[PDB]
Ligand SMILES: COc1ccc2c(c1)NCCO2
């Protein structure tokens with residue numbers, strides 16, 4: 001039986017700017033670094049950055065919707081978004097769903113999101129206003 | 138600050154086979170499904186499957202090392218991996234470079250992993266068998 005997400009690994013083209021982005025800009029804790037990667041944590045999340053020459057710096061129009069959302073409180077959301085904006089971090093989508101969301105790109109074009117709200121909150125909103133074809137289990 | 142992974146969203150090319158893979162084959166809990174997506178949980182992980190016409194079925198030699206690992210106990214690991222193998226689930230990696238792991242592909246070629254152990258346990262193992270150039274903070 002699977003019990004959760006064990007780790008998220010992102011392939012990166014240049015390790016130093018990716019470590020700067022996740023540790024310094026995004027505030028994650030750096031636990032270890034080696035010649036070809038790094039381990040960070042963000043709350044319960046174990047993040048691995050893996051240096052990979054096959055990673056392309058990918059424009060958002062050229063990647064699919066796969067993305068990674070990090071939790072933040074409503075109270076902290078606006079100042080964190082403003083920090084990313086000050087740093088010139090690109091946005092790949094505007095929010096049109098329930099719960100605050102800020103959609104931003106990492107240095108290699110990995111699609112990231114800041115989101116406020118749980119699955120339970122999303123399901124409660126969907127029960128009141130179901131998406132087209134929606135069934136609950 | 139950021140406090141963890143709020144959700145993982147995977148773009149999928151065909152919703153029904155992807156729901157079947159994560160719910161039936163991997164045992165995740167299906168909470169809701171609509172014409173363009175599904176919400177599942179795996180322990181505390183919120184997984185969204187999002188139907189995306191841009192998603193391509195991608196062979197593992199064409200994608201970078203970005204991957205998603207799910208936690209499993211030492212007692213359950215081998216039989217779960219063997220069941221995936223017997224079910225014909227494609228693989229993408231054999232060498233255990235980060236501990237007890239089984240590397241397998243979803244229907245669209247998303248790179249998945251079963252892993253036994255926490256970040257703390259991986260750091261302890263790396264102290265004895267470190268990656269080249271490894272520094273611990
Ligand atoms: C929308 O939820 C569902 C749930 C089960 C289904 C289908 C949709 N479609 C046909 C196969 O079984």
Ligand SMILES: [Mn+2]
Nearest residue numbers: 067069113146
């Ligand atoms: Mn999202």
Ligand SMILES: [Mn+2]
Nearest residue numbers: 009206235250
């Ligand atoms: Mn891994």
